[PDB]
Amino acid sequence: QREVFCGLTGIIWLHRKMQDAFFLVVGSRTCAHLLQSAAGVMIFAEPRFGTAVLEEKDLAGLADANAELDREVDRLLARRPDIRQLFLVGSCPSEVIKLDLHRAAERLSAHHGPAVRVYNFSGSGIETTFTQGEDACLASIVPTLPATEARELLLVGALPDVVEDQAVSLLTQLGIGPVRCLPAHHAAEAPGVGPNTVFALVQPFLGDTHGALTRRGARHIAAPFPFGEEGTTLWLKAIADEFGVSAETFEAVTAAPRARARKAVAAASEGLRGKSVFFLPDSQLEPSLARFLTRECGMSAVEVGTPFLHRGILGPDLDLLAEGPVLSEGQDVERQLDRVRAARPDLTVCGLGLANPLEAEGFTTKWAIELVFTPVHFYEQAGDLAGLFSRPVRRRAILR
């Protein structure tokens, strides 16, 4: 038994990233209830994710389901002329029904173009976990991107607009050339990928995304992920070195934000000093987070858990992360909870389902779902990340 969500959970923040994208989930009532419950207040704002329930006749006849899907997307386009890119999202019942979402997306991209472009990616739990939904969305975007011949830097990841602005400003004042972001808000702003175009990875879970841009000739930048202070520095240093920027120029670039990041981290890390942290596999963010907490926050790590390790992209953080913490990759809540109980960790990064139950048993818990939502990457928000991890400990100390 694994405690993860199917990749449809990434949809809610992907669609906040993409103002122009609608996320049509071809799934059963269970996946619609997933989207509704996960979103919470979000669904009452009339968001851009909707689920088409595969009715009994739909699972009975594949052709009837295909025609119904065609009519559904026609009605959706009629209702919303604003949507220019539409994401047909695979689901578990859709996969078992085996209706070809790729053949569909091809057909409706043909008969609704050149205005509306329809992509397909699978968020089904049978082949997707928490953040591989966003990974698969971005992987679906990559092949349709134009083949450029001018070298550009491509930031890949769902940076919040303020975090994107900080990263873009820091790069542009750093001295790089073109900087573009793969999750472009509008289809017109989609980046160009070519053999000469380079890309740097902001969030770890984009493994299939990195594989996708590797094929088009784009080359990876080996950097740690810009979570706290040093994690961000090493990221920008690798970017500068691949762009050939002089080290002294980059130091003059990054000295000013570095001091504030250090001060903010030290302000909120005081509660985390001399403490033990346990990472349950949630969002593939945990090796880097453990690196940040161990090196910067002075927090011992007993075990870091990951849904699946992508060693190539995650290598720098694992190298920075101490040899002591043992990385577990298998998700099995039955034995994992016994491991938590044996470890007796001060802080336990787990899912929202396990948060309250472990809290009752006497374990302070932090839920990693807040990391993807809240802006925690880069320097300005490093203190926010530290405080996010330190607040449960403060609450337990206050509440005794």
Partner: protein, 419 residues
């Protein structure tokens, strides 16, 4: 298909999950893909269960699709029995496993578990969450509840309360206090606050009390058929409904009707000078059928409101809701689509909206005072405090909760006029 964004009821297995979470010693083994564990986040967070839901998921993937599915189910059931030591086990299927070549029955009974195993056949694509909650409780009763010699003194069973239910916890206490005042001791409360031993003891009660028809009607009818227990047909929400329930339960038990009306303040507070502005207020009502019917009675007879709209998302209770709506001179709104309820609200333009969380948000966008009276709710709605909807103190809660939006709107409008 239709492009749904908000569903009033979840998938049917969520109802069985609620039933299992309510009981103690019962474990749900679900053939579901990894990612269907989200439903455990309702109980742990919205309901704030200090313990994990008693549910084990097989969590099969693309690799465990061809033949590994049955082996995964067998291993999950066996390991759940060994780890959790449940007094009984319920086995079911998710929406994905319906198309999968899944045999819950044989896989469950092959392991020869010493504890009784309850087999659940729920049509996932056809039915909804309340059907799951009703059918799971019914099948649990068939597997465990047996005809049994009645208790020496008069005993009653509270049938209907389940996990993730609207104020079920406080209504149990209120109805228990009412019955204790009447001289009736509650034999068992099921599904919530129950065990397989409690389900077995269900046969001991002299009569059944159906607080919530949605999740207990089928159990009550089966008890009437086999265990020879009459079941109450009045849900005690509101002063009038509470008195009718008290009279009917006293008739059923043979004890004298004794109800404690000392705490009751809703009739006096409604008859007060301050509640004159409540007269003739147009109220739109939506949500599950029992609460909507009871709330319409409360509004019209005790609150002075005129019911401008009625509705439910329960097709299984369309006939009682349509009969009630005809009673209030209206046509019921039996739909599960929030767009139709929104259209009815816009056309009707009610002064106050009593309904679900979706109706509360619709009223918020339309600037209409709102209160929550029905099942689909957030983490916010569940009280830390004693907030029953039934009994006399529940009537007090109903009055205060329904007035509070009107009071806020009136105060805001007054201070807007003044400055």
């Amino acid at each position: 298909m239709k492009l749904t964004l908000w569903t009033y009821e979840g998938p049917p297995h969520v109802g069985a999950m609620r039933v299992a979470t309510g009981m103690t010693g019962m474990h749900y083994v679900l053939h579901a893909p990894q990612g269907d564990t989200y439903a455990d986040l309702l109980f742990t967070m919205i309901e704030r269960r200090g313990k994990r839901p008693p549910v084990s998921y097989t969590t099969f993937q693309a690799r465990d699709l061809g033949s590994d599915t049955a082996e995964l189910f067998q291993s999950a059931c066996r390991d759940a029995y060994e780890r959790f030591q449940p007094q009984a086990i319920m086995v079911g299927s998710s929406c994905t496993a319906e198309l999968i070549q899944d045999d819950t029955g044989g896989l469950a009974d092959a392991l020869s578990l010493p504890v009784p195993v309850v087999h659940l056949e729920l049509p996932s694509y056809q039915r909804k969450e309340n059907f799951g909650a009703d059918e799971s409780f019914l099948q649990i009763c068939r597997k465990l509840a047996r005809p049994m010699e009645r208790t020496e003194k008069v005993s009653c069973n509270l049938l209907g309360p389940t996990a993730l239910g609207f104020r079920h916890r406080d209504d149990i206490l209120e109805v228990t206090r009412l019955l204790e005042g009447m001289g009736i001791a509650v034999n068992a409360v099921a599904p919530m606050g129950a065990s397989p031993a409690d389900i077995a003891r269900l046969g001991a009660a002299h009569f059944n009390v159906l607080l919530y028809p949605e999740t207990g009607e089928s159990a009550a009818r089966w008890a009437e058929k086999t265990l020879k227990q009459p079941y109450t047909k009045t849900v005690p929400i509101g002063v009038g409904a509470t008195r009718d329930f008290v009279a009917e339960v006293a008739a059923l038990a043979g004890v004298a009707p004794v109800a404690d009306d000392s705490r009751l303040r809703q009739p006096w507070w409604s008859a007060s000078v301050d509640s004159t502005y409540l007269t003739g207020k147009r109220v739109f009502l939506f949500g599950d059928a029992t609460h909507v019917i009871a709330a319409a009675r409360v509004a019209r007879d005790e609150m002075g409101f005129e019911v401008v709209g009625m509705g439910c998302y329960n097709r299984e209770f369309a006939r009682p809701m349509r009969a009630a709506a005809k009673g209030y001179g209206l046509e019921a709104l039996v739909t599960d689509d929030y767009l139709e309820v929104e259209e009815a609200i816009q056309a009707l333009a009610p002064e106050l909206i009593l309904g679900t969380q979706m109706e509360r948000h619709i009223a918020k966008r339309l600037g209409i005072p709102c209160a929550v009276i029905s099942a689909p709710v957030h983490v916010q709605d569940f009280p830390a405090r004693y907030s029953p909807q039934m009994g006399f103190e529940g009537a007090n809660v109903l009055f205060d909760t329904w007035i509070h939006p009107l009071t806020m709107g009136l105060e805001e409008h007054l201070l807007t006029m003044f400055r």
